[PDB]
Design an enzyme around this catalytic site. Structure first.
Site, PDB file in Angstrom:
ATOM      1  N   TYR A 112       0.817  -1.204   0.000  1.00  0.00           N
ATOM      2  CA  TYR A 112       0.000   0.000   0.000  1.00  0.00           C
ATOM      3  C   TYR A 112       0.851   1.253   0.000  1.00  0.00           C
ATOM      4  CZ  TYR A 112       1.033   0.776   4.986  1.00  0.00           C
ATOM      5  OH  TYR A 112       1.666   1.018   6.203  1.00  0.00           O
ATOM      6  N   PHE A 122       1.947   9.882   3.167  1.00  0.00           N
ATOM      7  CA  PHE A 122       2.204   9.660   4.594  1.00  0.00           C
ATOM      8  C   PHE A 122       2.829   8.322   4.935  1.00  0.00           C
ATOM      9  CE2 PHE A 122      -2.431   8.804   4.286  1.00  0.00           C
ATOM     10  CZ  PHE A 122      -2.508   7.502   4.748  1.00  0.00           C
ATOM     11  N   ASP A 123       2.727   7.333   4.052  1.00  0.00           N
ATOM     12  CA  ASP A 123       3.331   6.019   4.301  1.00  0.00           C
ATOM     13  C   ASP A 123       3.301   5.181   3.038  1.00  0.00           C
ATOM     14  OD1 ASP A 123       4.484   3.884   5.710  1.00  0.00           O
ATOM     15  OD2 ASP A 123       2.612   3.367   6.799  1.00  0.00           O
ATOM     16  N   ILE A 142      -8.281   0.191  10.150  1.00  0.00           N
ATOM     17  CA  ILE A 142      -9.348   1.206  10.027  1.00  0.00           C
ATOM     18  C   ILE A 142     -10.519   0.667   9.198  1.00  0.00           C
ATOM     19  CG2 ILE A 142      -7.827   3.152  10.506  1.00  0.00           C
ATOM     20  CD1 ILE A 142      -7.705   3.689   7.467  1.00  0.00           C
ATOM     21  N   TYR A 168      -9.217   7.693  11.037  1.00  0.00           N
ATOM     22  CA  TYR A 168      -8.727   8.029  12.375  1.00  0.00           C
ATOM     23  C   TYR A 168      -9.537   9.122  13.049  1.00  0.00           C
ATOM     24  CZ  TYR A 168      -4.898   5.055  11.006  1.00  0.00           C
ATOM     25  OH  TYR A 168      -4.180   3.954  10.589  1.00  0.00           O
ATOM     26  N   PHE A 185      -5.701   5.677  -0.240  1.00  0.00           N
ATOM     27  CA  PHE A 185      -4.736   4.576  -0.321  1.00  0.00           C
ATOM     28  C   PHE A 185      -4.847   3.916  -1.672  1.00  0.00           C
ATOM     29  CE2 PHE A 185      -3.260   3.743   4.076  1.00  0.00           C
ATOM     30  CZ  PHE A 185      -4.223   4.380   4.855  1.00  0.00           C
TER      31      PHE A 185
HETATM   32  C1  LIG Z   1       1.214  -2.753  18.327  1.00  0.00           C
HETATM   33  C2  LIG Z   1       0.659  -1.935  17.453  1.00  0.00           C
HETATM   34  C3  LIG Z   1       1.427  -1.399  16.265  1.00  0.00           C
HETATM   35  C4  LIG Z   1       0.875  -1.958  14.933  1.00  0.00           C
HETATM   36  C5  LIG Z   1       1.714  -1.468  13.773  1.00  0.00           C
HETATM   37  C6  LIG Z   1       2.030  -2.218  12.687  1.00  0.00           C
HETATM   38  C7  LIG Z   1       1.652  -3.667  12.518  1.00  0.00           C
HETATM   39  C8  LIG Z   1       2.822  -1.626  11.565  1.00  0.00           C
HETATM   40  C9  LIG Z   1       1.878  -1.191  10.423  1.00  0.00           C
HETATM   41  C10 LIG Z   1       2.575  -1.266   9.078  1.00  0.00           C
HETATM   42  C11 LIG Z   1       1.324   0.217  10.674  1.00  0.00           C
HETATM   43  C12 LIG Z   1       2.214   1.382  10.229  1.00  0.00           C
HETATM   44  O1  LIG Z   1       3.445   1.390  10.983  1.00  0.00           O
HETATM   45  C13 LIG Z   1       4.493   2.031  10.250  1.00  0.00           C
HETATM   46  C14 LIG Z   1       1.490   2.749  10.297  1.00  0.00           C
HETATM   47  O2  LIG Z   1       0.542   2.711   9.227  1.00  0.00           O
HETATM   48  C15 LIG Z   1      -0.029   3.984   8.888  1.00  0.00           C
HETATM   49  O3  LIG Z   1       1.014   4.859   8.429  1.00  0.00           O
HETATM   50  C16 LIG Z   1      -0.944   3.667   7.722  1.00  0.00           C
HETATM   51  O4  LIG Z   1      -0.538   3.799   6.562  1.00  0.00           O
HETATM   52  C17 LIG Z   1      -2.291   3.185   7.969  1.00  0.00           C
HETATM   53  O5  LIG Z   1      -3.129   4.061   8.135  1.00  0.00           O
HETATM   54  N1  LIG Z   1      -2.554   1.884   8.049  1.00  0.00           N
HETATM   55  C18 LIG Z   1      -1.548   0.833   7.850  1.00  0.00           C
HETATM   56  C19 LIG Z   1      -1.989  -0.114   6.759  1.00  0.00           C
HETATM   57  C20 LIG Z   1      -3.381  -0.641   7.047  1.00  0.00           C
HETATM   58  C21 LIG Z   1      -4.342   0.527   7.156  1.00  0.00           C
HETATM   59  C22 LIG Z   1      -3.934   1.450   8.285  1.00  0.00           C
HETATM   60  C23 LIG Z   1      -4.280   0.835   9.581  1.00  0.00           C
HETATM   61  O6  LIG Z   1      -5.394   0.507   9.897  1.00  0.00           O
HETATM   62  O7  LIG Z   1      -3.208   0.624  10.455  1.00  0.00           O
HETATM   63  C24 LIG Z   1      -3.519  -0.035  11.695  1.00  0.00           C
HETATM   64  C25 LIG Z   1      -3.865   0.957  12.751  1.00  0.00           C
HETATM   65  C26 LIG Z   1      -2.859   2.029  13.085  1.00  0.00           C
HETATM   66  C27 LIG Z   1      -5.065   0.825  13.381  1.00  0.00           C
HETATM   67  C28 LIG Z   1      -5.539   1.747  14.499  1.00  0.00           C
HETATM   68  C29 LIG Z   1      -5.451   0.984  15.806  1.00  0.00           C
HETATM   69  C30 LIG Z   1      -6.058   1.759  16.979  1.00  0.00           C
HETATM   70  C31 LIG Z   1      -7.497   2.131  16.671  1.00  0.00           C
HETATM   71  O8  LIG Z   1      -8.049   2.878  17.767  1.00  0.00           O
HETATM   72  C32 LIG Z   1      -7.538   2.987  15.415  1.00  0.00           C
HETATM   73  O9  LIG Z   1      -8.907   3.342  15.182  1.00  0.00           O
HETATM   74  C33 LIG Z   1      -9.004   4.592  14.465  1.00  0.00           C
HETATM   75  C34 LIG Z   1      -6.985   2.167  14.263  1.00  0.00           C
HETATM   76  C35 LIG Z   1      -2.322  -0.905  12.085  1.00  0.00           C
HETATM   77  C36 LIG Z   1      -1.867  -1.780  10.915  1.00  0.00           C
HETATM   78  C37 LIG Z   1      -2.704  -1.727  13.319  1.00  0.00           C
HETATM   79  O10 LIG Z   1      -3.623  -2.774  12.936  1.00  0.00           O
HETATM   80  C38 LIG Z   1      -1.474  -2.389  13.928  1.00  0.00           C
HETATM   81  C39 LIG Z   1      -0.521  -1.469  14.652  1.00  0.00           C
HETATM   82  O11 LIG Z   1      -0.851  -0.350  14.982  1.00  0.00           O
HETATM   83  C40 LIG Z   1      -0.728   4.564  10.117  1.00  0.00           C
HETATM   84  C41 LIG Z   1      -1.250   6.005   9.892  1.00  0.00           C
HETATM   85  C42 LIG Z   1       0.163   4.516  11.364  1.00  0.00           C
HETATM   86  C43 LIG Z   1       0.782   3.124  11.584  1.00  0.00           C
HETATM   87  O12 LIG Z   1       1.705   3.133  12.695  1.00  0.00           O
HETATM   88  C44 LIG Z   1       1.103   2.832  13.950  1.00  0.00           C
END
Ligand SMILES: C=CC[C@@H]1/C=C(\C)C[C@H](C)C[C@H](OC)[C@H]2O[C@@](O)(C(=O)C(=O)N3CCCC[C@H]3C(=O)O[C@H](/C(C)=C/[C@@H]3CC[C@@H](O)[C@H](OC)C3)[C@H](C)[C@@H](O)CC1=O)[C@H](C)C[C@@H]2OC
Length: 192
Positions: A112, A122-123, A142, A168, A185
């Site tokens: 992605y 952003f990523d 998300i 978010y 995305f």
């Molecule tokens: C132990 C935990 C760390 C664990 C981190 C990883 C496995 C590394 C993984 C590559 C994430 C990236 O690490 C570089 C980075 O990806 C972003 O840059 C991004 O592109 C993004 O948006 N993504 C990632 C790709 C899937 C969609 C989305 C997401 O849904 O991501 C999910 C997300 C953040 C969900 C939140 C969770 C809390 C809720 O409250 C909120 O609800 C609103 C939604 C991620 C995959 C979580 O399932 C798992 C984690 O968090 C975020 C902008 C910030 C995030 O860093 C944290």
């Protein structure tokens, strides 16, 4: 300013600007765009003011002015379709997958890239050579991803436009995503 021109190329996700001489064929711009994006020239179609550009045409030929926009189209030939679901999610299949279909319950594997609506990246999982795996339909990602990745086929590239309540929200994501941000995305499905 007299002899050269600045042009914007938009692909619906982000923008790159190019400055070329007004007498230089657009091939040079098209090739620079393709190479920066890691794409084959032959996969790309370029439009200006709705008219298809050919590579031997110059900005002078097309009466271009500084800051004019060229659209780069990578999506399947035949006309794009942007789908809006009942949640307000939007998606567009840029490439239709030929393989297995993604369904809730699977641990799927993707690459992605994510951008804000102003085109700032952003990523990207590709930038760290690191495919991303998740439980589809599990509430772990998300909401726009759980909804939007469902129905992709392996090989597919789908563009999700995610309103903030499916992203978010007002919280944003520390360091990365502002409050109330719409997210774009491009997701490429690699395996299910
Ligand atoms: C132990 C935990 C760390 C664990 C981190 C990883 C496995 C590394 C993984 C590559 C994430 C990236 O690490 C570089 C980075 O990806 C972003 O840059 C991004 O592109 C993004 O948006 N993504 C990632 C790709 C899937 C969609 C989305 C997401 O849904 O991501 C999910 C997300 C953040 C969900 C939140 C969770 C809390 C809720 O409250 C909120 O609800 C609103 C939604 C991620 C995959 C979580 O399932 C798992 C984690 O968090 C975020 C902008 C910030 C995030 O860093 C944290």
């Amino acid at each position: 300013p007299e002899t050269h021109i600045n042009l914007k190329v938009s692909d619906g996700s982000s923008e790159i600007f190019f400055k070329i001489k007004k007498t230089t064929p657009l091939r040079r711009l098209m090739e620079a765009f393709a190479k920066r994006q890691g794409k084959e020239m032959d996969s790309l179609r370029f439009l200006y003011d709705g008219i298809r550009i050919q590579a031997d045409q110059t900005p002078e030929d097309l009466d271009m002015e500084d800051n004019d926009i060229i659209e780069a189209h990578r999506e399947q030939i035949g006309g794009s379709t942007v789908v809006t679901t009942e949640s307000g999610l939007k998606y567009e299949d840029l490439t239709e997958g030929s393989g297995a279909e993604a369904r809730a319950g699977q641990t799927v594997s993707v690459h992605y890239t994510g951008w804000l609506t102003d085109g700032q990246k952003f990523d990207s999982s590709k930038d760290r050579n690191d495919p991303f795996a998740f439980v589809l339909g599990g509430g772990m990602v998300i909401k726009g991803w759980d909804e939007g990745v469902q129905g992709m086929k392996v090989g597919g590239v789908r563009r999700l436009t995610i309103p903030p309540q499916l992203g978010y929200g007002a919280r944003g994501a520390a360091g990365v995503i502002p409050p109330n941000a719409t997210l774009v995305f491009e997701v490429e499905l690699l395996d299910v």
